[PDB]
Symmetry: C9
């Protein structure tokens, strides 16, 4: 299989030796496998890993890193609004919101901490471009 | 096929879902048998668009947003700073509640100095960026 | 109009922005706002931002100096053995390290000011 | 007034917008004030803030920073003597001093910490000169 | 034979290595092993080590992304007020700072990858 | 007017008192109506003197004091180091009091290593400064 | 006199024993009156050998060991990582014991991210060294 | 005479120095002391300060090595299960991280010595 | 004596002045000693300390620093094996080892911490060479 070869490559990188990789795959698949069958799959995959990246592939990986950072920034921005909404409710002396959900106590430093980590994603994106 | 389909395939890959799991979830949304090589081809198209270099005004576009977002955060923290300083002055003079009626929360000097520094850090980061 | 740009930066997508105001109309305003933010700032715009920032720093520095004097007034009252001040306010506990920490943060505002004025003269 | 214009400039930098600045000054002063009256005071003060410093004014600000540091150093030096005086009394097994004041417990690291912060003010002054 | 080199690096002296296997025979094998390790590595050997390391990084990155989604799924359940998830698993407490910390460590794996691929192209 | 008046005006300004509050407090000391523009003029005179550049021997004057002050601190910490080491040796061998009669205080190895490092830091800062 | 005698004299000096204490302890091992100037002469011989500069392949000898030792540590930590991740998955789904029978220990997300980082640090240190 | 310079550096003003000894006489001695400290140091003066500092470092290094051996002797006694040593002294608890921390600080004294001797040869 | 002169040089560097050095040696040795006897021993030793190192002596001191680091590395490596041996016993649910000694609880981070400090000694040795 294709996923069988990936499972072998994963276990090798995760620290298992060919002997341990053969035992674990003998529980997954019915038919047992020898070390030469494992080592040849390694020999194929290891030469593919050693393929040096083109200059365009690094720029591709930079563009993906920025896009992944935008996704985290959107998740963190939604959390920042919840923290700030909770902070205003804490000062007003409310136990529940107008929505109905419970007010959770948030410290000023935690809001400013969350602000900095959202702003640092911008700075790193500017530095990357 | 769609505009959101292009973005959703790339989103799930960047959140750690492999091509197999992307195919299964997108089959529920867009009611078809979505193939694994279809997901990989969309990934390949996405990597080509992302590998293109940014323009000089596209850098200015991102810089302008970062500084404007910093201004929005700075006003949120500036409001928090005034509350802390108002609380400190009330605590210093032995008050439990303010004139308006809201309760006096205890604040340490180091917290006020810390909050001030974070506000000034944003201004330094603005000036340096310009 | 400015409020649309605010909600975009705070993390709300175009669809959610239309719901609060009440999508295709919103996306165009953000595209126009992109070109405004994409414009290169003038030197006189930068001089204004440096002037405002350093004046805001002086306001904070004046607030922290007022707190430094309170910490110092408390320390001498604590050391002399007083529970209460002459004016009637209570004597709060202060650690020597906190006074030095407060002094350090006041002194760094001068250093941050000098460094900003140094970089401004070159650029 | 002159202090009225400074109050407006302070509130603007502290984060208030012209609408909020007009409301707060309407409580301080009897007669209410419009936004154009506020914005024109901003327009005067903002152009004065944008005045670029002469090379002599930076040297002036350096000299003041060193003089402010000398004042803090004198306050910290007086505290260092109190810590050391207390440390010697702690070893001797005294609860009160010969003066009459109470002995307070001080750790060795706190004295050396206070020493370093006094010495760092010198180093920074030497670096500044 | 490789096991002798392992025990030497783990801190056991030649005398103790002979006791586990069962000294002069051991010292010679280490001297021969020294010359093998003293050999300069090829470029294709380095390309393999960079390929393995960055692939191992992707495996960790995929594991941490799976944990990030769990933390995020827990946070929304905690905020909405649920004790239990739909599938039957318990809702665990998550602090906002821990989610940002997890995001940061995932983002640094991209930065560490880009820096390693940048240094590889030059060398 | 006076020598201490010049210094006291500058001191209060550097401690965060504005020209108005400086005028009020100095009116009590020097028994006159001290004007705000008088305080501002003294501030202006002070800024001119401070803006003057330092001489090369004036740098050596400050450097010489900093190193001599470091020697005074080093002897204070060196005495503290011997007390900690004397305490450690007594604690190691199960003693409650010393031969002289003073009580044995508990000390950790890391504290002695920390105190030693701070003493050696002063020597590094001395050598580097020279 | 001996090979181990040369090494043992240098070892005791580097562990903080002075020439007097080295002479006393070595007199018990090698049953003679070991002189202080004999210890100092062995120290002098040792300093001459250590002062000699390293060869270019001697650097490669040490580098090769450091990377191989790093691989041995990395496999020890990689095994620990799998145990933590196996524990986390069991804790997530409300299990007290594993299928094999061993007990489920609680693990935090930050610990797994910390352990992963240390494993990746070794790979960075390997690549950089090469 | 040296005691006047000591009290000035410790933070006492000229007025307070006259009170302890028992102002215009004190200010002149400080002005004369300023010129002495203002004098540029010789190379032989610097060589003395480097020699004293590195010899003082060896004294500390010898003290920390003696403590390292005690920590190590305690660790082996703790691991073997002993409460008391052969000589009669008590076995104290030691954490592995503290032993490595102690080793690190001893090793940095060698590095600080080598760096100081390197900078001295140039200057 | 020779050790008497070293005791004087030690006490001077440890912070004692000639007056205090004379008092302490008057308790150790029967016959009391004057300050000129102390100061002349200082005068001899201080000129010997000011002897500038040859380039070979620095290389000698580097070689000793590396050899001292190897000794610590061997002590730390033996501790690492004890931590790892304990960690495996903790997972297996053993209170005592097959040897007989008690199992002590060790955290994963402490093992990886100990690993890094052993590996950092190598890195610093490579950097030194």
């Amino acid at each position: 299989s294709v996923s069988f070869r990936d499972r072998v490559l994963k276990l090798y990188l995760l620290g298992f030796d060919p002997s341990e990789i053969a035992q674990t795959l003998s529980l997954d698949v019915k038919r047992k496998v020898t070390e030469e069958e494992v080592l040849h799959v390694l020999a194929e995959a290891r030469e593919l890993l050693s393929a040096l990246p083109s200059l365009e592939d690094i720029r591709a990986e930079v563009g993906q890193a920025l896009e992944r950072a935008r996704i985290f920034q959107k998740d963190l921005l939604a959390i920042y609004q919840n923290m700030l909404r909770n902070y205003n409710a804490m000062m007003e002396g409310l136990t529940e919101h107008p929505d109905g959900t419970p007010v959770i106590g948030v410290r000023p430093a935690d809001i400013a901490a969350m602000a900095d980590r959202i702003m640092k994603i911008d700075q790193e994106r500017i530095t990357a471009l």
